[PDB]
Each structure stands twice: as C-alpha cells, then as structure tokens.
Ligand binder design. Sequence first.
Ligand SMILES: CCCCCCCCCCCCCCCCCC(=O)OC[C@H](COP(=O)(O)OCCN)OC(=O)CCCCCCCCCCCCCCCCC
Ligand code: SF4
Lengths: 96, 67, 155, 257, 171, 104, 98, 318, 115, 83
Amino acid sequence: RMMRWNQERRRLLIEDLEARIALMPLFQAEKDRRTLQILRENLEEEAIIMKDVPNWKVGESVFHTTRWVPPLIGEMYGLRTKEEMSNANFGFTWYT
Amino acid sequence: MWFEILPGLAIMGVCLVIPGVSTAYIHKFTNGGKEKRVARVQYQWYLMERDRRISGVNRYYVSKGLE
Amino acid sequence: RAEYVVTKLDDLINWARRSSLWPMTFGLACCAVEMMHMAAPRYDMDRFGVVFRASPRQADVMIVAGTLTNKMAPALRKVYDQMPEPRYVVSMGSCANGGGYYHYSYSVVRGCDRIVPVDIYVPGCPPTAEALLYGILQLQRKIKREQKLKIWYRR
Amino acid sequence: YPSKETAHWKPPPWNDVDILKEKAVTNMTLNFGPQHPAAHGVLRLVLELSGEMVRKCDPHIGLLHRGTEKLIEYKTYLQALPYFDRLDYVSMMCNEQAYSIAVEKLLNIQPPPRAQWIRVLFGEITRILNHIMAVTTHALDIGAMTPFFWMFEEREKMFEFYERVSGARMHAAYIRPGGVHQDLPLGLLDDIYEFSKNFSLRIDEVEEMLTNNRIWRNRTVDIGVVTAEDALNYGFSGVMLRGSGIQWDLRKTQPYD
Amino acid sequence: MNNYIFVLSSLFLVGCLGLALKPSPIYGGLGLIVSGFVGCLMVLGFGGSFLGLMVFLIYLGGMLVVFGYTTAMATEEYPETWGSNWLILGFLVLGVIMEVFLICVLNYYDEVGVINLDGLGDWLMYEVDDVGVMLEGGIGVAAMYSCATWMMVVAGWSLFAGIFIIIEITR
Amino acid sequence: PFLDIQKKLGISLDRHFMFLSAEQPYKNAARCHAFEKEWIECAHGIGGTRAKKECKIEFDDFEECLLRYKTMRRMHDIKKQREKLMKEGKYTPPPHHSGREEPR
Amino acid sequence: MPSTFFNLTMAFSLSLLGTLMFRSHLMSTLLCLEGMVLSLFIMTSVTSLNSNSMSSMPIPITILVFAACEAAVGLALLVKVSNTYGTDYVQNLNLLQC
Amino acid sequence: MFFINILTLLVPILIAMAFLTLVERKILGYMQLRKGPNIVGPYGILQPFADAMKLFMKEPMRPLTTSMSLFIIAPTLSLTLALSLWVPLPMPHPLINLNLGILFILATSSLSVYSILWSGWASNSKYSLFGALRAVAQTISYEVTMAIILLSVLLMNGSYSLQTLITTQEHMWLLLPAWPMAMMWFISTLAETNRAPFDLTEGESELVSGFNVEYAAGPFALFFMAEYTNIILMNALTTIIFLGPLYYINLPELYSTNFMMEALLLSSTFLWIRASYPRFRYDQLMHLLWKNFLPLTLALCMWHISLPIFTAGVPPYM
Amino acid sequence: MNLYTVIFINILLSLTLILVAFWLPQMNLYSEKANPYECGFDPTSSARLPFSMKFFLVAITFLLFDLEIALLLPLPWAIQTIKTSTMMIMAFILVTILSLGLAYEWTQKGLEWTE
Amino acid sequence: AGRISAFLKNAWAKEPVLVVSFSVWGLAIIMPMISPYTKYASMINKATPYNYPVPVRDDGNMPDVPSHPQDPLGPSLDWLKNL
Ligand SMILES: CCCCCCCCCCCCCCCCCC(=O)OC[C@H](COP(=O)(O)OCCN)OC(=O)CCCCCCCCCCCCCCCCC
Ligand code: SF4
C-alpha cells in the first residue's frame, strides 16, 4: 500500500510540476520586464535629478564584456526602502 | 474505582485539541478563509510575492473579473 | 478593604503548603515501617497530597521516626538545616519524642526536640499508620491557623 | 657542551621508559549517608570510587546503637522481652521466640503444645511479614515500586492477626518464657485460612512480574557471587549460604519448637 | 533588520574570543555551543537550513564528550574562568573595545570596503533564484552519491580507520 | 598534479568540480557561469604566464562578477551624495522609492 | 558577505591566537582548535552559498568529518596524558628535550 | 493575531502537563490499589495548582558552593526548549512549518541535555555530578538511534517536514511498515525524556534527586514543567510519524481529535512502564543500545534504502 | 521573524517565572543549608575532582558516528538523483564499513567499561 | 549440512538479533538484483521536469515531437500510469 501510493504521489507531482512548466513563460516575461523596469527607474533618478558631480557616467557599467549582467538585490531596489530590501533578503527564509 | 482518572484525562483532553483547532481558525481569520499557504521552495514564494502585487498588499485575494 | 484580602490570601497561601507538603525519606527504626503502611493502599499519603521526596531541598516536612542517637544527631540537624524555611517537623514514636526506651542509655538523645524544633508529636511506640496520619492531618491544620500575612499588615 | 642551564639535565634512559610511580588518585571518597533511601534510614557506607565502580567500601554502622545489651542487665526477664522485638523490627515474634527459649533452657522448662504450635504459627507469619519487606524493599532500590504497595495491603491484613491476638499491630509482647501470654479468640484461624488460600496467588502476581524479566534478571544476576566456603568464614549462616548451595537450616537440623 | 548578520557575526567573534582566552573547558565548551548556534544563524541567514543545523548537531554531541572528559582529565579544584581574575577580564573587555574601535576605524577608510556601515545589509544574497525550485542545500550535499562520490569514500574511510586508530591509542 | 594517475586512467576522480561552472547538481548555475567560462576557454593552450596579461579583461570582469565590489562604490557614492544632497534638500524622492507604487 | 568574512577571518585568527598562547591545559587548546574549524565551515559554506556553488556544498561536511576524527585522536591522547600524571597540565610534559 | 495563537499554544500545554503530574499519580495509584489525589479538588483536578503555588513560595536554595549563573540558566534552558519543541509540531497546520522541522527537534532535543549537565556541574555535589554524567552516557547511547530510527522512517518519506507525513499516512499508518523502528523509537523516546523505567539521572534510590538535588522549589519546577512537557512531545510524534490520524480536509479538527486519542495512550502507555519495570544499571543501557538496537537499526536503515529502489517507492520532494 | 515572536516569549515565560521565585519566597539564607549535601554529613573531598569515567572509548565512537549520522542525512534527497545505482551501492558501502568498524570494536572489547 | 546449519539454530535461539541484522544486510543488496521493478527507479526519477525543457529550433531535421505537446512522438510515459 506504500508501493502503490508513493507511485501516485509522483504521478501527482508530474501533474503539479508540468503546471509550473506552462507558466515559466508568463513569469519570466513579467520578471524580465519588471527588473528591466526597476533599473531604468533607478537610472532616471541617477541621470539629471541627481548626479551633477564631477566626471561621472550614469548608465556606466563596470565591465568590458557588453553582455547582460543579471542585476542583483544590491543594485535592483538597493535604494528603495529597507522593508522592500528585507523581503528577498530574509523573505522566504523567514517563513512566508 | 478507575473512572476517577477520566477527569485528569478529559480535562487534559480538552487541552491538546486547542493548539490544533486554534492553529487553523487563527490562520483562516488572518489568511482570508484560506490556509496559511506555506512556502518550502523559491517558486511558492514567488507566487505569493506576485499575488501580493496584484491587489492591496494583502495577498489572500483578487483573481478573475479584471481582464 | 485590605485585611480581608490578606486573611484570604493567607488562607489561600496555606492551602498549597498544607495540601502539597512533601515529607522526607527518613527511617532509622521500627516506627518507619508504619510510614510505609501509610504509603500503603490502606491509608494513602498521596491521596492527601503527601509525597516522599528523598532530598531536603525538595522537602517541606521532616518525619522523625526512631531513636535519634548521638551519632545520627549531626546528620539530623545537618538535614533539617538543608531545607527552605517553611520547614516543619513531625516526631513519630516515643523514641523520638523522649527516647522512651533508651531514655537512660548513653547513645540516645532524649528527644528529637533537643536538637530540631518541632511542630507536632505523634505518640505510640509504633504509632499506628492511622496515628501519624492523624498527626500529618493535624500538622496540616496547625499551619492552616498560621497568620503570616496578617501580622505583616499589622506591623 | 655543558652550560649552566644544562648541567641539571641528567641523560635519558635507554629503553625510553622512565620512572614516575606516583599513586596520585584518591578515588573520590563518597558516602551513602543516613538519608539515601537505599540505606534503610541508617547507614553511612563511605566509598572509594573510580567513577562509579566500587573499589573499597567502609560501612560505619553504629548510627542506631542504643545499648540494648546493657539495659537487659538492669531489667528482669519479662521486663526485657520487648527489647527483642526491636532488634529485627520486621520479624518480631521470631526474636521473642528466641529469647523465650534461652530463658526456658536455663529454667529446664518446656511450654505446652498449643503454645508451641501458635509460637510456630506466628514464627512463620513473620517469615511472610519480612520476605515481603525484603522482596519489595530490594525492588524500590532497583526501581519497581508496585509490589511494595500490593503486599502492604496484604501485610496489614496480617498485623490484624496480631492486633486481633495481642493488642499492638507490630510490637506484640506475646511470646514469653512462660509459653504465651494469652490465647486466640474464636474468629482468628478462620481468617488466616481466608488469608492463606489467597496469598499464594499474590506471589504469583509478583513472582510473575520479576522472575522472568530481563531487567530484574539482568540486574540481580551475577551480583554477589560469594562462594560457599567463604560465607562460613564470614559467618552468614542464614540465607546467604543456602543461596549458594549449603544445605543448612535450624528447623530440619535443630528443630526447637 | 539590515543590521542582522553584522550582529550575528560580531556575537560569533565574541563567542570565539572568550573561547580563545581559554577559561575552563566547560565555559569554553559553552563558548562554542553558542558560537555553533550563532553559526547556524548566518549559514541560514544566507540560505541553506541544512548546513547550519549540522554544526548544531555535531557540536552538541561533540561538546557532550568534552563535558565528559574534562570532568575526568581537565579540571582543577577551582575552575577560575572569567569572573575569577583580571587578566582575562581585561582582555575580554579590551578585546570588545578593540572591536568597536577597529570596525569603526576602517569605515573612515571606506576605500577597500572591508565594512561599509552605511552600505550595510544591502549586499547579502546576490541574485539568487526568485523563480525556481529544487535549489536548496542538501541537494548539493547529496552529491556524495552522484558526481562527487569520492568525498564519500574518503570520509567514510576516515571513520572506518578512526575506529581502529582510536583504540590503539587507548589500549 | 604530481603523479597524475587521473589523466593516465582518464577517469575524473575529482577534477570535475574544481571551479564554479562545473556540472551543478541537477541543472543549476553558479552565479558567474558566463564569466568563468569566458575566462577559461580564453586561457587554454596559452597556459599560465600568458593567461595573466592578455586574458586580464576576463578576470577583471570575473573578479567583479564574484566579489562585486565596484558596484558597491558605484552604489555607495549614490547614497553618500543623496544622503548629502538631501539634508540641505534639493531632492524629493519619488513615490516608487519611498513606498507607494503600482506593483506588477 | 564582505562584513562577516573579515569578522570570521578575525574569528579564525583569535582562535589561532588562542591555540598558540596556552593556559596550563592541553584540553582547552584542543578545545580552541574546533572553533578554529568552525569559522572555516561557515566561511566556506557562505562562499559556496552566495555563489550558489552547490557542487562545492559536499565540501563543508568533508572538512568536518575531519574535525571530529582529529578531535577523536586528540581526546584519546589525554587519556594517555592523564594516566601518566592524572592532571592534564601542559607544563608537565617536558622530558623529551633530554 | 499571532500572539493570540502562542497564547493558545503554551497555555494549553502547561495546563495539560500540570494534569499529567496528577494523572501520573492516579494511574500509578490504582495499579498500586491506592487512590491518588481525591480531596484538594473533586478528583484531584486541583492538586497541581497547590503543588505549583507551593513551590513558588519556598526558598530557592542558592547553595554556597556553586556557579550561580549556570545554576539559574539550566531550568531557563530546559523549560524553554521542551516547550519550544511544540512550535512546528503539526496538528494539521503548524504554528511554524519548517522544511527541516524534525532536525529542529533532534538538535533542540539534544540541548535538553545541557540543562542536565550545566546544572549538576554548577551545583557542587557528588550526587549531582553523577546525574550529569549519567546523561552523558545516555545521550551517547540513544542519539545514534534517534536519528537513524528517524531517518529510515523519513527515507520512505521525502522532506524532513513533519507536515508531509500527514500525506504519507493519508491511507495507512506507518506503524505497519516499520514496527521495528517504532519499537526502538519508543525506547528512544524513553531515554530522551529521561523519565523512564530506566531513569538513571534523577535516581531517588541511588543518586538522590540526581542533577536536581541542590535545587529547591523555585528552579525545581522548571524541570518537572519541562520533563512532563517533553513526555507529551515524544508521544505526539509517534502520533504523527507512526500512528497517522485522519486528515480529510474539510474537518481538520478530526486529525486533532484522533491526535488526542492516541497521544494520551502513548502518554498513558509510559505510565504503565514506570509502574512495571526497574532500571538498567547504566552499563546495560549502553550495552542494550549499541549491541542490540544499533545493528538492527543499520539493517533496517539499509532495508528501507533498498525498499523503494527495489520496488519504486520513491518519496517526492514537493 | 515569526519564530523570534515565539521564542523570546519562552525566555520571558521562563525569565519572568524565575524572578517571581527568588523575590517572592521570604528567604532566611544563613550558613548551613547553603552548604552541599552528601546525605547529612560534611563532604570529605571537594566535589570537583577527576571523575575518571569508564566509557571513555564509546564516547569517541559516538564522536565519530555523529559525523557518520550527519553523513547519512542527505539520503532523502539523494534518492531524487537520476542515477540511483551509485546511491544504492555507496549507501551500502557506508553502512557496511560502519558495522565492520562497529563489529571490530565489539570483539576487541571497546564498549565494555574497563574495570 | 549439520556442522554449519545447526550452528544457526542456537544463534537463532540465543543471539537472535545479529541473525536478523546479518540477514537483512545480506537480504538488502540481493533483492534489487532479482527485481522486475528496479529499472523504474532511475526512470520515474528521470521523468520529473524540475527545470524547464529548453526547445530546439527547427532546422529541417530531427523528425521528433513537433511544435505541439500532445503529439504522439517523444517520451510519452504511459508506463508510470498503468504501472
Ligand atoms: C536561556 C538560554 C537560552 C538560549 C538558547 C535558546 C535556544 C533556542 C532553541 C534553539 C533553536 C534550534 C535551531 C533553530 C534553527 C532554525 C530552524 C530552521 O532551520 O528553520 C528556520 C526557518 C527557515 O527554515 P525553513 O523553513 O526550512 O526554510 C524554508 C522557509 N519555510 O525560519 C527562520 O529562518 C528562523 C531562523 C531563526 C530562528 C532562531 C531562533 C533564535 C532565538 C534567539 C536565541 C537567543 C535568545 C535571545 C537572547 C536572550 C538572552 C539569553
Ligand atoms: S518507639 Fe517503639 S516502634 Fe518506634 S523506634 Fe522506638 S521501639 Fe521502635
């Protein structure tokens, strides 16, 4: 009865994981345009309304490669509030 | 006789049902009639933090009716 | 009102001390056999909230059964001077009250009361297990009628 | 190339093993004072431990001496009879039965038969008052508490066979040199029968609980393996020698009553 | 919140400082059950819940032996640990003032970025996984049985031989 | 390695997880796959002393994919300015950096 | 991450600063040698856990199977230091220089 | 609204424990043919309040030869932990769900030792040093087995989350697959939770009130509050890991209601033990548990590895 | 955060319950009840001397196995690998060499309480 | 035999633990080698799509599964069902 049941829990997982397969496109699309909306929306802050300093480029990368750097929490919403900063830092780790 | 033990049990026996049945009704009240919606993986947390962003900041609501 | 509140607190403070008093695993003579027959299924201590704990730090009353010799006497007040001090005492026997037999011998103290102060005295050579039980029901009201918060208010 | 800082360095040994006979152990002298429930109220039993294994014990029995070999000296033979209940405060009549014979021997007297029979009857009820007090007290120390309680409903049922015979439940000055002080009442043997038919099952209700376990059988076995010819050199003579195979008893060899 | 791990980290440095002063092995062992617990926090403050608990399972059953032998080999008539002299209590209080000194020194030299008390708490995870599954630790530790099965034989053999290596030292 | 009895047998005893971009457990990635790859396919057959001067672009980048330092001073110089700019003003933070926005 | 490793490197060093200055116990130096390991467990796990280098996550246990097997051989010598002296003082073993 | 859940999670276990002090005195009594408490309340229902309110009036002994810091922290550390183990304990939906919700138990179960070591080491006394040492070789004995008897069960379950077993037991109790594990688990729930037929640590008859003898009333209750609070966990787990009650998620109070019915038996099953069996002499317990259970454990540990791969029964990582 | 709300409480539930035990009993601490016990006598030695245990070797075999236990714990995830034939074997190899290591000590008188 | 087969008889009467252990040991490795269903453990565990299946791009080749999931080509596990 643990043979025939544990098999089914796998059969339900495949049912439950293939659901996740169908929605990677929608999420990855939202996640791309979202994080690609954060850091233009940090640039415009950093372009004119701030940064009238000496020699300073505003869209300035720190690489020679020209490829896409996946941004990160320290850059992406690194200058929102702390609670929005403390929600990927310590979001899932601190129990939903 | 031995039936004098039942008070010690059936008063202990109305004392360990509470932390089970109170743990759900307190979740449903806070979670909107649903369950606590635990998150073990990084995907179930994404759905929350998505659903947290499709409404007011509480995430136990809006779905279809929008577009 | 304050006195009425304090009389009831002092009546309510004692209900615990008198119900759940934990005597001490003493021995030393025949008299101790009757304490076992007071732990027996005829005259149950545990029904009265009375429990043997074999350490004084966990204890609330000493039951002195048996001849308190001169060698045992330091070990009897080294033990009475190891409890907290709501500590009570009970002297089972006529060897512990006065040294009934052995009152005139040389290696016997002529009373538990020579050494530790006592709240109650149970007579009988082997006092019946229903005669300590009358005593530790009488010690159980001898501090029902203690007024330890009353005499704090009027002080 | 000796220096002042090296003239004290004697050379080393050849086998690379030197001499450091210290004997610096001290073995943690502990005592089972007269409050430990193991000690039956009175014993001290100073130790020399090596952790928990026992290397040398040194009992200081004497914390209950009163002097009832010196008080008999000042009290006549009837006025000293109840001292003998106190010696073994568990088996009372068996002491009275002894002192009530050493006196009789000196007097060249024998009691009547009906006294001898009842003097034997209680001599072997005390036999049951005690092995209850030994089977069970030896189990409190080991952990099993219940057969203590099961039998002290059965044991008080026998103190009512003194209180219904003598007056006192426990210290019954009943077996004197002059036979026995006072006869039985009409409703006594009819109750020992109603007690004796059933006591044999209460052993089975305990003897079951203990004589087949592991724990009891892995906790007492191979403990105290005192050999035969050393018990006699030590003078046990009661049960700590027939428990090692010495067939000996003073009722098949020296029947007195 | 932002100052979470710097606290768990400085309470670890302290749990390993008094550990270094060498009090009696009890209050050093206590000094490690704490810092082992605190290690389960920051290991867990950066993700994996497995690896933190491990230290907080080994060095409980580890320091349970350290309590045993010290009562038999390493213990004085008087432990004389922390509140017992002034040689340790000075360099337990001047170690901590040296800490609050030193970390506050080199935020003024905010050029190597060893600590950035103003830019603190914003660089801890670095773009983890947000849409994802089957990612935690313990999937990596279970590579002992797939693709890293030499970490497994080489550590198992150590415990196979430790059991022999240990008794020849006692015998 | 000295006494290299791994290539001699061919098998990968342990030379298949020396670095980050090395067969992660199921299919995951090690946060700098794109850079270590570009660093080490560069420094192959040119080994050693000439992997240190011409293949410096790929390490200078991988030294910043991993340490990720220059992004801190480029993100601390911001705060240092804004924390200085405000506190004497001249800056009103928008809604979407002080809280209230329209999440997506 | 670059606030703990200076703080964990500085925790390694204090334990390295501890297991070189003794205080009349061999069993507090062995003891200081495990908190030394412990800072390397954590300063190895995090590096293998911010980089998401799960392939290296077998390493913080293999480091630690030799944290107790070394302590085991370490503890077992005290049995043979005690059984000569019974005191476990480091000042008591100086009869090799001869 | 979360504090109102802790308040309904800790009150209903300190108020239950209290009546286990009572129930551990009556059930033991009627086996001894002796009524327990009958008097202070109707049927002894009001005795622990006396016992409790009695102990917080007597002089907490600050002994002259001790370490007054660890003296006070052990009962703080005992009542904390064994009370804090109820946090993830899943009546159907727990207060705090955890992936590694059972390693949380094992690790925190081990810190219940240091309340017994630091206590008796602080308190200068031979009869408490022993009880400290009596736990050292006890934890050494079972803790090898409270993992593997707990692994091999969770090996034909997947994640260590205690919540998964409610779905693993959706149609059957794991007592039947693993009664060998459940036997040795029961005894390993009985060495941990030193209350036992083999107590060996609070030995009244050998080590009188071991690890506990220099402690007077105030600190003393925090061990009884912790020991009799821990008796109910390690039976509450058996009512989760081996005895699987009814989930049926529209009446989740059926789980909690059958969770009652079995936990009281397993909490009332320990009570037959103390009234039925003596102790193991402290050299058998480690010869009974490295020799008899440890090989038999590794076998079934190996059998349940070759149980699913033999057949198919692989637990999923949800 | 949600757990810190559970567990700072239980320290306070313990810490608030201990302050109301030292400052609400009315004590009388003088000399002879503070001094240690040993069953009604003045203790001979100093209570803090070498115990000299006898299970010294088993404490180490535990010290080695707590690693080995830890070295088992990733099996619930290891079965979710695609191979499940090295996980098969290498789980037999670990458990077997243990029992071999345990059976050698079992015969060479390791867990036997030197005496 | 007798001089080996009857030695197991006391070792089953006394020492009745190591016989189980030494049996279940020898009875654990042996059963997967004589099973009908051990093949599936490395297959039921290989079907799980934890990661996303990256599609290839059609370049006039690979007559496999077309751009349609419910299309009869490809790894259509009807063995997990109807096990
Ligand atoms: C008297 C002395 C008392 C001091 C000792 C107290 C001991 C307390 C008991 C020990 C705790 C056992 C170890 C706990 C480790 C965390 C358990 C865990 O792994 O889960 C944590 C959980 C995230 O893990 P997970 O759920 O699996 O991730 C998926 C998301 N659901 O969710 C989390 O991320 C939360 C993790 C942090 C919780 C740690 C609790 C610390 C409590 C504070 C201790 C210090 C006391 C405060 C100071 C007072 C002064 C004494
Ligand atoms: S009074 Fe009587 S029963 Fe009590 S000890 Fe003395 S002789 Fe024995």
